Design a protein around this ligand. Structure first.
Ligand SMILES: *[C@@H]1O[C@H](CO)[C@@H](O[C@@H]2O[C@H](CO)[C@@H](O)[C@H](O)[C@H]2NC(C)=O)[C@H](O)[C@H]1NC(C)=O
Ligand SMILES: *[C@@H]1O[C@H](CO)[C@@H](O)[C@H](O)[C@H]1NC(C)=O
Ligand SMILES: *[C@@H]1O[C@H](CO)[C@@H](O)[C@H](O)[C@H]1NC(C)=O
Ligand SMILES: *[C@@H]1O[C@H](CO)[C@@H](O)[C@H](O)[C@H]1NC(C)=O
Ligand SMILES: *[C@@H]1O[C@H](CO)[C@@H](O)[C@H](O)[C@H]1NC(C)=O
Ligand SMILES: *[C@@H]1O[C@H](CO)[C@@H](O)[C@H](O)[C@H]1NC(C)=O
Ligand SMILES: *[C@@H]1O[C@H](CO)[C@@H](O)[C@H](O)[C@H]1NC(C)=O
Ligand SMILES: *[C@@H]1O[C@H](CO)[C@@H](O)[C@H](O)[C@H]1NC(C)=O
Ligand SMILES: *[C@@H]1O[C@H](CO)[C@@H](O)[C@H](O)[C@H]1NC(C)=O
Ligand SMILES: *[C@@H]1O[C@H](CO)[C@@H](O)[C@H](O)[C@H]1NC(C)=O
Ligand SMILES: *[C@@H]1O[C@H](CO)[C@@H](O)[C@H](O)[C@H]1NC(C)=O
Ligand SMILES: *[C@@H]1O[C@H](CO)[C@@H](O)[C@H](O)[C@H]1NC(C)=O
Ligand SMILES: *[C@@H]1O[C@H](CO)[C@@H](O)[C@H](O)[C@H]1NC(C)=O
Ligand SMILES: *[C@@H]1O[C@H](CO)[C@@H](O)[C@H](O)[C@H]1NC(C)=O
Ligand SMILES: *[C@@H]1O[C@H](CO)[C@@H](O)[C@H](O)[C@H]1NC(C)=O
Lengths: 371, 99, 453, 49, 50
């Protein structure tokens, strides 16, 4: 008659909204006598002591689903890794809520992890669509971050399988280096001029300074980046007219937490239809036996489709990701980010704004200077 | 024999005149270099990683160092799987040279 | 330095022989300080994996950690990789679930395993398929993760080999259940050799479908990776007697013989790092960021003559794989052993195991003997640049004796050509039979030598 | 072209002991009878003959 | 007439040996002879066999 739900959450003031959403979870779901029990833990500057505080609390508390979200960490790693590792030791679904690192897509590494925010690799899912819109058939892919950029390049090559075309030239290098103009000078001789970049901020400022000192930001040099390259000091050093993306309800954390609580609530009320309700035992004290219906409960969590909440139409794919997200296309109109189009699940819908390109006129630059 | 000896040189003959005819008809300039060995190009495994390689003119082509090979290029099935050809301009076979 | 070897196993092997594994070992001491601490444990919870690790790091700043296991839990290697990333301590995995392969490491992680990647095992399986000229095959993979990288590695391996791999398109499955369109995709298989990538729970359903769709025939082969064939005890009855898998869990190379090499790897790396940097002890103070590490240093190592080098991704250069089969006694035979870099096999005479289940009777395999003659049966070595009998030649075997003091010899696989070879190929086209060809080692054509032909 | 054809591989196993790098050195080798035959493209041979 | 083997069908429900006999077929034209109650199951199996 009780269901334990763990919370590994950033601030104390969002814990009140978390408990309110827990209270509203049993509100309209009938007179059934199930209970929802809450436990909230916060930031620690040391990473081992995070999992040390999480394990003997939540495993002995016998939680079924753990909601983990920590944006305001001054450490640039942004890793909720040890909580997910500890709960995946006994196959307990950690639902990531704010981090977007593409290392969590591999379920061979994170054995029982799910997430409700899309990672950066699915930004490539927009970019090929951009190639469908403005007649772009020859792109130049540049990847700085070798950690997740291999997966992004793999996703772009998967999206280029049906067209059976490739990029003109793909380039990768060390995250953190400075002398990066030798890549761009060999990228200067390329006939196409549509340039797509995937990087982090410490490399984004370097490649922006390199493109500024080589004067490779003028006419024809069409840029296309993601969310990492438009934040920090990279937005300050950004070349004018750059086209990036913005997450709708990506940084509004509390509404996404409430939507995740509604997701977990409908998943629990769907799982209570089935019998064989096993419990993950007190594995911290001696119990090496893992929970038996881990993949069963996870496969219940996979195909869950929704229509209510701030997210609303939230659905999980074969990788357990945010199906059909909404990205606002942002343009750098005189160092000011202006929304110049939206994107729902299947197609780019322009608004009535002016798309100021990084070169000259508002007409699209067909940047194919055939030699 | 020669580790590094590259001087400006005078190239002429048949295919050079063909290239001059193409640059006369189609509006483009050019910059002729030569290949860094004496091989046309074959399909040879490198030492490790279980990977094939093309050397020679296809080697400098597929590395991006060239864009158009104007040479006595023998048309076969193996090269046409990886690069596109045009229609031929001179037809030959194979024979023996004796004394 | 201080090095701890902790072993978590229910199969109770004692700890004092590890102390015996230190006295005569490292007799020529190149470091100025070698110290070992052996510990045993019967619990494998992460609470111990935090607490005892912090105790050993507070225990005189232990720089070397060696962990072994006997269970099937791969999340232990996921925990220890994070612990090695946080504590700056090189940690080695030995066996059990701790040696199970994880995909992507961290640059701040110094964790290493004794095991082979899915790409190296795919290379071994394709070498097996090349050595038997099994060029026509298919690929049946489920949605168990790592499958996209596996299919991509196969498709990159096909386009870079002198074999000419006939690749039927990759049949993938939606769920583990017997769906309609998945059954339609499985019925499209008309080839023989199938690379089956799945998990141990999925294999029972897939091979039950295979028996339900006739895919367990006497000509149909089945080659699977290591993760689906785990414990040697738990082998379900839904496996065909004739399944070939590859796994490095050798019964000869025990745990002590592997940790005897791992401690030598650690001491060799520390002693060679002492030749370049002075302050080898660099540890973390307490649980509650140096530069000179052994992560970027032990690219090659040669302990006891054996090559035990590592890769940039964090694997073994020379992993000791074993090619096992599933014989008619429902057991796993140590059939193939891995060579220097190449692969050797014991059964060059490939056994039938013609009935996978109890009742599969057929009569279409033929044993054919012949003899070397100059216009008819020209027998030559295989082409060493390609390792392939080219398509006018056919595979054959010859029992070439190594020495004549004993009767030992090797069934060397060679290439036949000439006139009768084309006759046998056209007969196999017309009559449509499966034939096995081998040279005779008794002698010439024939003579009744004292009522013995 | 002689590697693909399965009935011309034997000459291949001869020519792997004798193949050269440039045409003119082979012309000079067969010119002073250091070689004895030379299989080549017909246009170059009909020019140099 | 280039003729393939005489594929017979004992039962369409056994789904093991008769399916292998159908897998032997790769020719274009097939003459079929059975009853009306069996042809639905035979062509339903041959549809999923391509
Ligand atoms: C996204 O918004 C559009 C706005 O109309 C929806 O409509 C579809 O738009 C696509 C654009 O390629 C058309 O191909 C479809 O025919 C449109 N459908 C209809 C019936 O109008 C679209 O449904 C919205 N949602 C999705 C699926 O992303
Ligand atoms: C359930 O909720 C309370 C709220 O403070 C929490 O402290 C505790 O973990 C749980 N207590 C029970 C009744 O188990
Ligand atoms: C990068 O390297 C080139 C090498 O010539 C040098 O000219 C250039 O100044 C370097 N740029 C930076 C930013 O280091
Ligand atoms: C700026 O652009 C002009 C365009 O001609 C170029 O000449 C110049 O070299 C660029 N500046 C630098 C320092 O690269
Ligand atoms: C986040 O969404 C909730 C629900 O609509 C709303 O109450 C809150 O103001 C939003 N926060 C912002 C300003 O992003
Ligand atoms: C629970 O699991 C057992 C396993 O044998 C199964 O027999 C039983 O039907 C299951 N009960 C239900 C209805 O979930
Ligand atoms: C994305 O937009 C569509 C259309 O308004 C909506 O149905 C869906 O719920 C939105 N998803 C998010 C991010 O809330
Ligand atoms: C060109 O050829 C020879 C041999 O490779 C080399 O030593 C030298 O640099 C050059 N000599 C001539 C003949 O120009
Ligand atoms: C040919 O090329 C030149 C230089 O790019 C260009 O200015 C001119 O318009 C072209 N003229 C012809 C004859 O096509
Ligand atoms: C392998 O590398 C060595 C050293 O460069 C070279 O001598 C040898 O020819 C290479 N083998 C090939 C061509 O794979
Ligand atoms: C290992 O098992 C023994 C015997 O049951 C027990 O005394 C001990 O508590 C277990 N391990 C430890 C050190 O806790
Ligand atoms: C091992 O690596 C070193 C470089 O650190 C190399 O010089 C040496 O040749 C290698 N070992 C041997 C003996 O081959
Ligand atoms: C085979 O082992 C030898 C040492 O006996 C060494 O050359 C190399 O590691 C291996 N590779 C070769 C040459 O096959
Ligand atoms: C066979 O016997 C001969 C006797 O001289 C010996 O030289 C040879 O090594 C033996 N082994 C083989 C090749 O069978
Ligand atoms: C056995 O055979 C091998 C290879 O022919 C040879 O090297 C060796 O000397 C032989 N030994 C004897 C004593 O026959």
């Amino acid at each position: 008659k009780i269901v334990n739900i763990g919370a590994v959450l950033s601030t104390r003031k969002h814990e009140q909204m978390f408990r309110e959403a827990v209270n509203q979870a049993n509100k309209r779901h009938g007179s059934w006598k199930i209970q929802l029990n809450a436990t909230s833990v916060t930031h620690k500057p040391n990473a081992i002591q995070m999992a040390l505080s999480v394990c003997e609390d939540l495993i002995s508390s016998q939680v079924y689903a753990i909601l983990v979200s920590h944006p305001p960490t001054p450490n640039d790693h942004f890793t909720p890794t040890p909580v997910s590792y500890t709960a995946g030791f006994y196959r307990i679904p950690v639902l990531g809520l704010t981090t977007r690192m593409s290392i969590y897509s591999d379920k061979s590494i994170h054995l029982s992890f799910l997430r409700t925010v899309p990672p950066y690799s699915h930004q490539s899912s927009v970019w090929f669509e951009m190639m469908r819109v403005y007649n772009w058939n020859h792109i130049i892919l540049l990847v700085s971050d070798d950690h997740e950029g291999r997966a992004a390049q793999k996703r772009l090559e998967t999206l280029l399988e049906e067209r059976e075309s490739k990029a003109e030239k793909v380039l990768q290098f060390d995250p953190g280096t400075k002398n990066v103009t030798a890549l761009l000078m060999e990228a200067r001789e390329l006939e196409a001029r549509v340039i797509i970049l995937s990087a982090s901020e410490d490399d984004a400022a370097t490649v922006y300074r390199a493109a500024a000192m080589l004067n490779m930001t003028g006419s024809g040099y069409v840029w296309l980046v993601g969310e990492r390259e438009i934040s920090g000091n990279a937005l300050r050093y950004a070349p004018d007219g750059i086209i990036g993306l913005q997450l709708i309800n990506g940084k509004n954390e509390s509404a996404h937490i409430s939507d995740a609580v509604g997701v977990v609530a409908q998943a629990v009320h769907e799982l209570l239809e089935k019998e064989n309700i096993t419990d993950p035992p007190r594995g911290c004290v001696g119990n090496t036996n893992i929970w038996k219906t881990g993949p069963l409960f996870k496969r219940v969590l996979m195909s869950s489709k929704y229509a209510d909440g701030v997210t609303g139409r939230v659905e999980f794919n074969e990788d357990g990701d945010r199906k059909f997200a909404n990205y606002s296309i942002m343009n750098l109109q005189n160092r000011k980010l202006v929304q110049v189009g939206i994107y729902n699940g299947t197609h780019v819908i322009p608004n009535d704004r002016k798309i100021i390109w990084p070169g000259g006129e508002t007409e699209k630059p067909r940047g194919y200077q055939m030699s | 024999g020669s580790p590094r000896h590259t001087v400006p040189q005078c190239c002429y003959g048949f295919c050079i005149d063909l290239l001059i005819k193409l640059a006369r008809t189609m509006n483009f300039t050019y910059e002729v270099h030569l290949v860094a060995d004496g091989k046309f190009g074959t399909q040879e495994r490198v030492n490790n990683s279980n990977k094939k390689e093309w050397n020679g003119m296809m080697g400098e082509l597929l590395s991006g160092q060239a864009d158009m090979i104007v040479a006595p290029l023998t048309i076969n099935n193996e090269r046409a799987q990886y690069i596109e050809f045009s229609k031929p301009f001179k037809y030959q076979g194979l024979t023996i040279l004796v004394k | 330095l201080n090095i701890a070897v902790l072993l978590g196993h229910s199969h109770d092997v004692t700890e004092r022989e590890l102390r015996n594994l230190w006295g005569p070992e490292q007799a020529t001491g190149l470091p100025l300080d070698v110290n070992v601490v052996a510990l045993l444990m019967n619990r494998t919870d992460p609470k111990s994996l935090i607490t005892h690790v912090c105790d050993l790091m507070s225990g005189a700043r232990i720089h070397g950690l060696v962990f072994g296991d006997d269970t099937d839990q791969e999340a232990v290697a996921q925990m220890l990789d994070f612990i090695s990333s946080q504590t700056f301590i090189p940690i080695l995995g030995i066996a059990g679930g701790a040696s199970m392969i994880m995909a992507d490491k961290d640059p701040t992680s110094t964790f290493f395993q004794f095991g082979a990647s899915i790409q190296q095992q795919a290379t071994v399986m394709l070498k097996i398929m090349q050595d038997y000229d099994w060029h026509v095959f298919s690929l049946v993979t489920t949605i168990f993760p790592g499958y996209r990288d596996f299919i991509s590695f196969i498709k990159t391996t096909v386009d870079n080999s002198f074999v000419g791999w006939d690749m039927q398109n990759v049949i993938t499955l939606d769920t583990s259940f017997e769906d309609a369109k998945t059954q339609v995709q499985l019925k499209k298989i008309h080839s023989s050799v199938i690379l089956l990538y799945c998990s141990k729970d999925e294999a029972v359903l897939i091979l039950s479908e295979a028996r339900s769709l006739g895919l367990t025939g006497y000509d149909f082969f089945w080659i699977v990776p290591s993760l689906v064939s785990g414990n040697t005890e738990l082998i379900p009855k839904e496996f065909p007697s004739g399944l070939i898998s590859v796994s490095y869990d050798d019964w000869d190379y025990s745990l002590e013989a592997r940790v005897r090499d791992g401690l030598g790897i650690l001491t060799t790396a520390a002693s060679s790092m002492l030749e370049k940097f002075s302050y080898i002890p660099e540890a973390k103070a307490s649980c509650y960021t140096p530069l000179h590490t052994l992560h970027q240093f032990m690219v090659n190592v040669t302990w006891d003559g054996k090559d035990l080098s590592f890769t940039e991704e964090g694997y073994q250069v020379h992993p000791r794989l074993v090619v096992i089969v599933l014989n008619k006694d429902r057991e796993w035979e140590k059939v193939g052993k891995w060579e220097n870099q190449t692969l050797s096999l014991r059964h060059a005479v490939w056994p039938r195991y013609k009935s996978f289940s109890d009742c599969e009777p057929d009569d279409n395999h033929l044993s054919i003997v012949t003899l070397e003659e100059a216009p008819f049966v020209i027998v030559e070595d295989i082409d060493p640049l390609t390792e392939t009998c080219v398509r006018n030649t056919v595979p054959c075997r010859k029992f070439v004796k190594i020495n004549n003091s004993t009767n030992e010899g090797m069934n060397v696989k060679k290439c036949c050509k000439g006139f009768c070879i084309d006759i046998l190929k056209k007969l196999s086209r017309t009559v449509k039979f499966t034939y096995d060809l081998y040279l005779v080692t008794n002698g010439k054509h024939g003579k009744k030598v004292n009522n013995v032909w | 072209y002689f590697r693909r054809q399965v009935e011309l591989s034997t000459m291949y196993r001869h020519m792997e002991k004798h193949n050269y790098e440039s045409a003119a050195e082979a012309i000079q080798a067969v010119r002073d009878n250091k070689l004895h035959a030379f299989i080549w493209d017909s246009a170059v041979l009909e020019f140099e003959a």
